[PDB]
Symmetry: D2
Subunit: 454 residues, 4 copies
Amino acid sequence: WTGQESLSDSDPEMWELLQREKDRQCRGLELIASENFCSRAALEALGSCLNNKYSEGYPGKRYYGGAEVVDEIELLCQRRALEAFDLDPAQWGVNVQPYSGSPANLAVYTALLQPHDRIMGLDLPDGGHLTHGYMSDVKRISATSIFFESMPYKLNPKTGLIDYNQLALTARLFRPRLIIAGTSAYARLIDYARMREVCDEVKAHLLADMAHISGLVAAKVIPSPFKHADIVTTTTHKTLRGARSGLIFYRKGVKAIPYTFEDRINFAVFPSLQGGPHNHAIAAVAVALKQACTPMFREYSLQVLKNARAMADALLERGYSLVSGGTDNHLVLVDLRPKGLDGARAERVLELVSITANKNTCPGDRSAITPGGLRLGAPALTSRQFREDDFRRVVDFIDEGVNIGLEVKSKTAKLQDFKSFLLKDSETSQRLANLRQRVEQFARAFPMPGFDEH
Amino acid sequence: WTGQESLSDSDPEMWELLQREKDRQCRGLELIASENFCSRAALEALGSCLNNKYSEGYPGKRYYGGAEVVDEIELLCQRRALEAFDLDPAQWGVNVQPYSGSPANLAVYTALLQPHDRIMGLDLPDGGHLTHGYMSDVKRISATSIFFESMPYKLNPKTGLIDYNQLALTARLFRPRLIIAGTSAYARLIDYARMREVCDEVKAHLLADMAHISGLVAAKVIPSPFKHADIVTTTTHKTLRGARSGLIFYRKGVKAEIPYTFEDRINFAVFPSLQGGPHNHAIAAVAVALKQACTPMFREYSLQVLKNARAMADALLERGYSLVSGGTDNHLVLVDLRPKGLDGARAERVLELVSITANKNTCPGDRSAITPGGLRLGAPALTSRQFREDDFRRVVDFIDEGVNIGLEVKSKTAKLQDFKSFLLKDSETSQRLANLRQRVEQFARAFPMPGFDEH
Amino acid sequence: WTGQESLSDSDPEMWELLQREKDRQCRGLELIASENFCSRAALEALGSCLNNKYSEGYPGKRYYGGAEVVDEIELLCQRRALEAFDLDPAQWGVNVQPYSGSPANLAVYTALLQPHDRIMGLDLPDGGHLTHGYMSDVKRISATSIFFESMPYKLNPKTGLIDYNQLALTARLFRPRLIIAGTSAYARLIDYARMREVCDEVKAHLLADMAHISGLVAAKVIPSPFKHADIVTTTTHKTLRGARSGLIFYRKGVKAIPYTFEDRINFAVFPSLQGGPHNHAIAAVAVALKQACTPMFREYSLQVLKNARAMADALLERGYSLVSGGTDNHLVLVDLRPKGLDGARAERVLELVSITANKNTCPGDRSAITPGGLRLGAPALTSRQFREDDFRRVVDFIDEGVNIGLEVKSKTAKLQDFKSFLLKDSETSQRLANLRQRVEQFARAFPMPGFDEH
Amino acid sequence: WTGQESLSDSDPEMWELLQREKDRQCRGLELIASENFCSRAALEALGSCLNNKYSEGYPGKRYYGGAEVVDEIELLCQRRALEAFDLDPAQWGVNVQPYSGSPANLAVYTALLQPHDRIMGLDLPDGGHLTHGYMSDVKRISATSIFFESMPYKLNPKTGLIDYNQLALTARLFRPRLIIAGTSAYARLIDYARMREVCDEVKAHLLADMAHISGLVAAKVIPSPFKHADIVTTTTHKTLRGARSGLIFYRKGVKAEIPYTFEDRINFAVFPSLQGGPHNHAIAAVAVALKQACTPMFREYSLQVLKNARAMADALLERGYSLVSGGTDNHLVLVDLRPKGLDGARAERVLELVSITANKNTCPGDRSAITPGGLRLGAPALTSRQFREDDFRRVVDFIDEGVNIGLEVKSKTAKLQDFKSFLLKDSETSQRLANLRQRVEQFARAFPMPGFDEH
Ligand SMILES: [Cl-]
Ligand SMILES: [Cl-]
Ligand SMILES: [Cl-]
Ligand SMILES: [Cl-]
């Protein structure tokens, strides 16, 4: 044993599973708005010898020695992160050590707030994320609502947009210390200027969680939250198309009276919350951040917006309802209730024909078992060089699946009868098998980033 | 742009940096007890298309669809995790989603305890970890000391061992809800049975943090904490020689009928309470390493780790060095440099300049954290490069030369900053370091190195 | 020394001060809505040998022995408390050990809530009490907002009433565990039925803090909060006209599923929060509770309502504005801004002519230094057998003081110039001295409960 | 109805109950160390028109008006409070508004500490008070253990004294922000200087809860805790012989320039944080009692309290009784009945049936709280009735008879419930108790009694 044997030689069982997942990604239409396909260059840095280095601390302030190369990689990732978003190093710093997006948010809360301090974020069924302080009527679900006190702001159910007026009213009474401007399922742009006004009035910090839109912000195809936010967190996957990791952007310099974010943010990441950094992920992120500075990436992000708009119009022209009427970013929210179907049924039918989407709560749903919506995303297929006409062909495949689900629904009662009818009824299976073959044959023809077999 | 270009072609600046780190790992004597060299097979799974899949939830209970392959990989990693430690699936479950060791411990605290509940762990200067509840006299350092109430237990400075008597005394007064059995700088075995007795008396859960010794436990070369602990956390790197990730083991079944209620709370704390999407590429890399830990090869490796640590301990004693607790029973050695006339901060800097990486360590008794009087040395990393006993005796020879160079510089300098600058400024000293570095690097480059050839 | 010497013989310095305070109470017009004059019978029980008994625990469950007489007194106080409010002993219990009203509320929070649990109460400038969870924008002021998380509900600024709609909206988002229905400066009745609906929807307990109106509730001259509340707290002074102490009423029996308030409420009072009971206060309360069961007390409470209505109409007929337009209880809220004066100036002028009231925040005040209102109360002077015509004569004296303050205001700049002008200007002093003599000569003619000289 | 009717005329049921309690206090031997008999002068101020005045705030800084007389009374009570304990107004301030001793301690915690801050006090079975942070193994009892984090320190069972060594050991690990020096069942003096040394080392505030001994401190018959403590709380009843209320003393001025920041935080915690309107009738009654504590009469009383406690201690030792810590230095005596063959719960019930009120007390070593092995006896109450040494020797004679009656009943009964019923059922036993009660009540009625004549 030398430790230099290949995976295919030493673990055939695992190598086979890697190839099955690689084939599943190539043969299907990936429409989940949070997925993307990472480049081979970043994956090569992710599976590197940088996994073997413990570098607790920060560049120039390490606990162990022998960090001369790791220091340059982390400093390079910091520079490339500031360059990717056109930030002045005198006004902004960045922490590149968060393991993921959720650790990045919890580090910001730990740095700036005492336990049980108050935060406000968009409610989960309204498009927010779990780490924005989600708790039910019975249980504290997210740790952000356990160690801190959260109260959500909601959507205007008539416009499908954030109710900035009700947010301002409740913020005066709740007196939050930090407000989160960021979404996971929201097809419109956030009025960061209005969020800044609410934060300035109640004297709260403005955290921008741009995880879903970070790539579009880097390519300057949508307004940047850095103009108004005190803290900016993001994932490095999603629309940034990198390895799974997290980033924290914080203001530094003079506030009015200097800013005090830097020492607190860094101390919260380490030694408060995390252990040894994952230098292999940090390097893979630095690879992806460099790609985000090229004209290629701006062209890709522009195509993401165009492909999402094309998918929205193609759905409208076939008589589908869209939450908020349309889209201004990378995703679309489809209300299937006017068509007589729900998201739980559509998600299962589309999955059986190699089309991956996720059900989504719509403004008006009182049942979480069968949400009335569906969330569709452009960034993944756009990375396979999909164009507007390609996404209209995707809408054609989706409509076939929806129509099949409508006929299965009229022949079944509850959701369990619906799911089994798709597998048992040999007439529906043959119809699903034919649609799947046309989907997979169409999807396989496009290129795929990364390695060839895994 | 296809995303299929190589790193060397598309990002030469990063490709050069990866190669310099690979050269640094090959040419140096890595003696930090926390490190190991991961196999190429695990690294290939780490940098794969599994990075592209969101699979929030657990096998069979996923938020999104298209997780049929990911469900198999996570279930396979769970099966291999129980096999590697010889656990009965009817009595033990495992969660393979923690991002690292620190998230694994934090997930256990949030699962079992309310905010401000009481925790006891070994004090940090005594050999505990940050995530075991470290506070200073002026500030709460670890988040485990912010969201929860911690009180440390200490070593007996006479013997260098954990004072189990004083632990039982203070646990009766403090009444902790959870006691942590686990260390980062400790050369002896933990009396898990005595820890169990104390936990049973005060009705506390026993958490075993075996991150440093998990590889030795898998090879069954030291007693297993699974015989006494309620919860077992570990890193997947360190002595398990895998990719960086974490694991949580928990009992299930009948407790006394009276059942164990760990499974649902542990899994819920990881997701959706604390973490987001799992890192399936890391999970697969862990599954590869766990398979390797079941082979006879890994048992010979862990046995060699113990032999190499004992040989390094004996060779240090032959040269008039003193060891905390007088020796070692595991993978590391704690050296007390105070009788020799040097400190840990000075020796650490001298050894680093000759490509010998170690870390200074606090000794039982002192309190100066700027100039600790000790040094921590580990065997797992070099043993993975097929070092043997005679090779580690050779390593002590180089260390002995470095300590003597540091002793000469100490008598010519006053402060620590003057000591560090003298190693770079003095031309005679820099020449003695350069020749020692060349002999060290020539010695280290001859041994094999796991992973890829150039990155 | 035997310990049987009188106060006048052993401490002449203290006996003189007791007589000065007794004279000050007889010669002035006491209009503070929270004051009253306790009967001699209750004061005789208050200064009794019951001060000498430690009786930690509850009747039949004491820590020490020799509590046979104290057990009967506490049990008698419990019975008389239930009889004073017409409560079924099978549906209600009472704890008579709280030292005051504020300890009674904190005991309820400690019994029913974990630390940092959420409560809602009427905001302090809107008429609520400090113990209802008051915190400013800079500091947590009340301990109820330190150990627990409070968010206030407010008044509708246009009607001067509680905004029950905004309360229902914010309660759904804040998710409180306990809502407080009770006021310290509010001239209208509380819609306890609507409060019960809001509590039933968000699954919160309804606490009624009837300290100001407890006497009126016992005499059945206003609706009782016991029909809708889960917990009822009150002071024993104020309109109950007893010694200073507190009471906690709690539901017992079957809820739907038995109630679990009794064991938790009692345990919170002792041994959690308080030490040895004050048996001298408990007996003085039992004396006052017996008086509240007589037709005399119902006649007194009816006169309190009539005297407050008479003071309101007399103020209206002289061109004064009243918050919420009038009154339905024992107090009136006077808005002095339409008359060109504030509460800080009126309070000082009235105090100089032996008329005691307190300034009060009005709906619309942005300055707490000079509140625009004044709180006037009927229960104190009604205990001296004041009638409707007597209170109209009180309004005559107040109007003279207000008119004097208006002339001093036009001759001064800030509040400090106003206060000194009343003492320095020998023309204003002579005018204040003449009004004071007419006030004191009028007030001295009425009887006074309690002892004759102290 | 004028409100000027007497209690005997308007409420005969309550007037009869007051007279029965007055007769019970006159005819019994009150030996509960917590009690005293308040003078008539203080009781007259307690039941006065000061009950009618709302004066939220502090002198000069009141919410309402018409407080010119109330301001003088509160300021006079503050002046007399500093005079009674010989304090310099430049170095010490006092707050006279706490409703009782427990609110006084809670106000200090909320003033100086954040929620969940750490507190150390003497454990309840060891002689501490509930408000010092008492928890059980199953529940948080005191609110000081709910809003704050408490860990007890214990007695040395060998000597019955506070283990100052173990306190210093555990305080270094626990790191409390405040340490409480004060007891409810402790017969020896507290080494406040040693407590100060421990607080200085861990940077904690020293709170002296002198509620039981405040009268002895005012008369300067025992060392004063004001020489070492940062904050001093006390009840105004107990040995101060006043009405039931509380006091908070705090240092002011220069700490090391570095000033003391206690005054504004202490006053703010009392109002508006915790309490509402002050009880001015109680404040005036306290002011009367504080004036009495400055006279030579009160010094002779406190000296007689010490002599009477020593005489009761010597008389108990003459009759083969054992005392916790071997004696007493203050106002109370702790008797260990375990060598005598009885327990505290049985003796307490027998003594109560013959008009001798005491309370059972936990002894150092045992854990049965249902049947404690000890008894707490106090001298202040009977000393206020002009008892002398020979009178307390007579009191021990009655106690000795009761303990022997309880011993005979113990050999005829099995359980505690059978023991209690046998004292009422057995005709021979009830007759022996009735004759002992008549001799006790005849002895007690002959002594004077402070307060009013009939209520
Ligand atoms: Cl997402
Ligand atoms: Cl480590
Ligand atoms: Cl009030
Ligand atoms: Cl006591």
